[PDB]
A paper describes a structure:
When TRIM21 detects invading virus-antibody complexes in the cytosol, it catalyses the synthesis of multiple ubiquitin chain types to drive a dual sensing and effector response. Here we investigated the antigenic features associated with a potent TRIM21-dependent anti-human adenovirus 5 (Adv5) IgG1 antibody and determined the kinetic requirements for efficient stimulation of antiviral activity upon infection. Domains DE1 and FG1 are the least conserved parts of hexon and contain all adenoviral hyper-variable regions (HVRs); discrete linear sequences that have diversified extensively between serotypes.
There is a single Fab and hexon per asymmetric unit, meaning that three Fabs can bind per trimer spike without steric clash. In the free hexon structure there are 30 residues missing between 135–165; half of these residues are now resolved in the complex. The remaining missing piece, between 145–159, has an unusually negatively charged sequence (EEEDDDNEDEVDEQ) and forms the core of HVR1. The visible part of HVR1 forms a very extended loop that projects straight from the top of the spike. Of these, HVR8 forms a finger-like projection into the center of the VH-VL binding site, whilst HVR2 contacts VH exclusively. With the exception of L2, all antibody CDR loops contribute to the interface. At one side of the interface, D52 from L2 makes a bifurcated hydrogen bond with residues K431 and Q434 from HVR8. On the other side, E181 from HVR2 makes a bifurcated hydrogen bond with the peptidyl nitrogens of G53 and T55 from H2. At the center of the interface, E435 of HVR8 hydrogen bonds with the main-chain of H1 residue G32.
Numbering used by the authors:
A (entry chain H): 1 to 218
B (entry chain L): 21 to 233
Write the structure that this text describes.
């Protein structure tokens, strides 16, 4: 009844994006497959379509460097995009229309990022407060993670268990390096004693380093 | 193109409200305007098509209307599961085009900002470079003039903010900054401020950290 894509997602300038949409529960000879993308902070943007007979219609703004092919028997549609740039960064979808009725079936996604950075790992610098007033009986601690590529990362508190007021934040770019921060709000008197150990998990890098909390002696 | 101009970008609401979104098309689209729902992680969900027709398995609280260029999308009673992005789409003509989004908020009427003023550590300075963090967990609304100032200044060099999704359980935001500073930049001004300009207290709710106290 549905559609499914490929990678690879992460590539550098002047290189071909090459997704493949594999289809089931309907024939390519009965329906078009459209290719759409969502750029971050933007609406959806339509790139092109291949209709049932093979006709193909590209958005003019990508027509210099876009191509859609298909094989009806194999239930495959092949998207390509011929010379990438840094603002070609988005989730690229394949999708399909009803008979009858508009776009209503979607591929799962392809996260793609355009940049020329080596896979460098983060550096976990933990945080605990700087003295002064300790009233209210609640104080928030931190765990700052700097300088990584690519994304994403899991920022857990005490091995994926403590997560009641855990607010991990969306990252931000720092010249081919991401930096994001994490917080946890826990009561005063037991941290101090039963302190929380912070850790991190990077998939394409593979480092899992832990850090415990100790303040300074003012 | 056809450009689909969607309005308004945010509606703030509480449960049970009646709320209309609007889409203006640069060209007559006849009646080929459609409306979708976006819950993050999940893929888009077609609600209404051809302006007013309702898709497979969609409750009659979602309606719509319009012909030509002016279209309307009502929800007469909102709920937990209507708390998401919404967008118009036109398929009258290639290139196919979309509205920019209407995000739906929820109203936890006023709240106080849990400002947690921070410094670095010796444990940070392991490579000769540091960073002065500031968390602000749970506040309402997002209208917050924050600044990492030094003696009442606006030199914003190295200020490196963040924001979050309105967490569905407690329905209030959070914030995160990172005032980056080098080896020698780290000794100059004696103290610095994590500001807040909330209507919770109109006298500006400053919560500083100094190098001495």
């Amino acid at each position: 009844v549905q559609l499914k894509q490929s990678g690879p997602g992460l590539l550098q300038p002047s290189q071909r994006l090459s997704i493949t949409c594999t289809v089931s529960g309907f024939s390519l000879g009965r329906y078009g497959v459209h290719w759409i993308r969502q750029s971050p902070g933007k609406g959806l943007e339509w790139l092109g379509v291949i209709w049932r007979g093979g006709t193909t219609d590209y958005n003019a703004v990508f027509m210099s460097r876009l191509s859609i092919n298909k094989d009806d028997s194999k239930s495959q549609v092949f998207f390509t995009m011929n010379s990438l740039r840094p603002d070609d960064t988005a989730i690229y979808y394949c999708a399909r229309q009803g008979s009858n009725f508009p776009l209503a079936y979607w591929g799962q996604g392809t996260l793609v990022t355009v940049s020329a950075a080596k896979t460098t790992p983060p550096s976990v610098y933990p945080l605990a407060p700087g003295s002064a007033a300790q009233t209210n009986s609640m104080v928030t601690l931190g765990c700052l993670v700097k300088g990584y590529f690519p994304e994403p990362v899991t920022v857990t508190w005490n091995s994926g268990s403590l997560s009641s007021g855990v607010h991990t934040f969306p990252a931000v770019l720092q010249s081919d390096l991401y930096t994001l921060s994490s917080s946890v709000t826990v009561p005063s008197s037991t941290w101090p004693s039963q302190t929380v150990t912070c850790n991190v998990a990077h998939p394409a890098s593979s480092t899992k380093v832990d850090k415990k909390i100790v303040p300074r002696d003012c | 193109n056809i450009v689909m101009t969607q309005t308004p970008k945010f509606l703030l609401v509480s449960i049970g409200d009646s709320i209309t979104i609007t889409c203006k098309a640069s060209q007559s689209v006849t009646n080929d305007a459609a409306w979708y729902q976006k819950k993050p992680g999940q893929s888009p969900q077609l609600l209404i098509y051809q302006a007013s027709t309702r898709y497979t398995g969609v409750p009659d609280r979602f309606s719509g209307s319009g012909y030509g260029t002016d279209f309307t999308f009502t929800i007469s009673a909102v709920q937990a599961e209507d708390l998401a992005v919404y967008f118009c789409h036109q398929d009258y003509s290639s290139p196919l085009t979309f509205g920019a989004g209407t995000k739906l908020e929820l109203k936890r009427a006023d709240a106080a900002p849990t400002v947690s003023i921070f410094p670095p550590s010796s444990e940070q300075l392991t490579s000769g470079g540091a960073s002065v963090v500031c968390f602000l967990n749970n506040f309402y609304p997002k209208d917050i003039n924050v600044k990492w100032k030094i003696d009442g200044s606006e030199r914003q060099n190295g200020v490196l903010n963040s924001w979050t999704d309105q967490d569905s359980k407690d329905s209030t935001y959070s914030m995160s900054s990172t005032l980056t500073l080098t080896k020698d930049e780290y000794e100059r001004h004696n103290s610095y401020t994590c500001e807040a300009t909330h209507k919770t207290s109109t006298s500006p709710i400053v919560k500083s950290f100094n190098r001495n106290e």
